[PDB]
Amino acid sequence: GGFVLVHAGAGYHSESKAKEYKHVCKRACQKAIEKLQAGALATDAVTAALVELEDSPFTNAGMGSNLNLLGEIECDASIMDGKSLNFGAVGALSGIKNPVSVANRLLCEGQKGKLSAGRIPPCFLVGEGAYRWAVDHGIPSCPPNIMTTRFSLAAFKRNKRKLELGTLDTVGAVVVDHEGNVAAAVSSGGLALKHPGRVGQAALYGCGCWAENTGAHNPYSTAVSTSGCGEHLVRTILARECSHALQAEDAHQALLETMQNKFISSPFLASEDGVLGGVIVLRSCRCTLLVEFLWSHTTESMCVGYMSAQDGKAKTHISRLPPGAVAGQSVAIEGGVCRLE
Amino acid sequence: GGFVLVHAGAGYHSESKAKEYKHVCKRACQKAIEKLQAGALATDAVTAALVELEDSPFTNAGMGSNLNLLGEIECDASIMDGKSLNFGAVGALSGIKNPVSVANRLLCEGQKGRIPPCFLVGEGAYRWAVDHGIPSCPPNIMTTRFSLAAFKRNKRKLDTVGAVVVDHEGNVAAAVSSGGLALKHPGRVGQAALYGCGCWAENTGAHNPYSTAVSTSGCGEHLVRTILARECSHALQAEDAHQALLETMQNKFISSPFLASEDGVLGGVIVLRSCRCSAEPDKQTLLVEFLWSHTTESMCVGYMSAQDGKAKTHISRLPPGAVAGQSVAIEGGVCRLE
């Protein structure tokens, strides 16, 4: 009993490179299910998925991240637990191989702080301090020669040159365990030639991801993860906005109206010539657990992968805008249902 | 014409330091009004107010901010413009005397503006500030005799600021600045730097009949988990502003499921709500409703109307019967701007 849905970016996935994108999404789903079947917490499950997605040298997160203006790697990552509603995140973090692991550990410590442990522990750390906290907590440090790849280094030089004259490939995942507990996480390398210290949506509470279990004013346990233009997702606090919209009976219609009204037609992005973003969503309710999963995006395409523990084989797919639709002006949306024991 | 409301923290203001807090609030308001009258933008006005608030050795923001675990100063600050809806923010910033001025520069550059950065942290935010003409500030200038003694004290083991403004056309702006928790771990970023949590400013639009501006104070974590600033803005779109804010503080803050594990929720907000109530097509009047609410023992505020030219200061305190962290105090008023 368990379900996972992951994504490897919302932007453009060429037919020639589609294969690679889907393969990492497949592996990420398996890592997540393994954790669930092994009795792990939902958060540890999404973290396992994200570690796999970050580790791919082809994703703008962890190893392979876009090099900033100075040719350095600074990552943003966050995670949320639907049961405890606790959160963990890091921004402008360099020197660490798996940013999500740090965000996960901040979340874990935060949980330890609830059982009477002085003032609330930090949920958000950035830069040098985030690095120090990671190391001091036993998290593996990673050298620049390992975080950087020949290709990212080469893109850096090109980008620099183009100034004197891919980045949308971020990652995310959502999971629901057999008890109905959900969790979500997101990780990113940020904009390709960003100014040092720039923090994007992947580190911001409510913007990058969201996870909230069923409650008095929350009939469904919901989890959301985002991708696309970081700035667009932040100004609209998209993840949380999608989670709240999903409380409506018709999930597909609620997500569609959100992407159209609260995103594309949002007054907060009125000055933009095209709004770019995508989301993966999970909604669950106890009856067995009925799970509804969906993905929506305004980008050319979005790579997704999902898997049910009882089913066994991951399904991967590149969602594309239909003929006629225009990237940044229209919305693509697809989904399905699965019942868990 | 214009109106401004500021706060010098939500927590506890001793009767012996009251006059000091109120005084800083008076100057901040005067600073903002002087800007408005000089024809400045609402964001420039709220920034001027925050600079004054920050510059006080009595406030946990800018100079005088709490020293962190390593005895160093790291500030959080943000600002939002209601007309353009643009935002500017900095987190874990050191070496800069006025964090809010850096956030205001980020917002301005964003307006001139792929989209420029609206949020910078650490060394990067520092570099950016210096590169745009804002001189650095050595440690001794931003460390007061009180924060140093406090640090040594602390190591031997809520005075944050904000402001909301409305110009003569009805454009609103909001800003917030904080030094964060005393002895916090390096890199810890709080509510004052996060979009939706620290402040919020949004002019009348399709989904919101009222122009609203919100600034917060109190326990950083509590304000973040509930994304209070933005929640208040949305609540203020209801017909009855006073009742809406009260219900928000009661249900979405004190009774929020996101803070259930806590024994007492601590925070306060200052809000401004505006709409055009009349015009003479043959001159216009803005109805401005302003409020402040809190669950802490007290909250220090100050407000001023350009037309009245008389700054008003006040320390809101929980009355007998109200328990800090469990109750909600709320006060407000209304004024018209011609």
Swiss-Prot record, chain A:
Its EC number is 3.4.25.-. GO terms for cellular component: cytoplasm; cytosol. It holds the Pfam family Asparaginase_2. InterPro entries: Ntn_hydrolases_N (IPR029055), Peptidase_T2 (IPR000246), Taspase1 (IPR037464). It comes from the Eukaryota. CDD domains: Taspase1_like. GO terms for biological process: positive regulation of DNA-templated transcription; protein maturation; proteolysis. Keywords: Autocatalytic cleavage, Disease variant, Hydrolase, Protease, Threonine protease, Zymogen. The active site is at T170. GO terms for molecular function: identical protein binding; threonine-type endopeptidase activity. Protease responsible for KMT2A/MLL1 processing and activation. It also activates KMT2D/MLL2. Through substrate activation, it controls the expression of HOXA genes, and the expression of key cell cycle regulators including CCNA1, CCNB1, CCNE1 and CDKN2A. Intramolecular proteolysis generates 2 subunits, alpha and beta, which reassemble through a non-covalent association to form the fully active enzyme. PANTHER family: L-ASPARAGINASE (PTHR10188), THREONINE ASPARTASE 1 (PTHR10188:SF8). Belongs to the Ntn-hydrolase family. It is linked to Suleiman-El-Hattab syndrome: An autosomal recessive syndrome characterized by global developmental delay with poor expressive language, poor fine motor skills and hypotonia, microcephaly, feeding difficulties with failure to thrive, recurrent respiratory infections, cardiovascular malformations, cryptorchidism, happy demeanor, and facial dysmorphism. This is Threonine aspartase 1. It comes from Homo sapiens. The gene is TASP1.
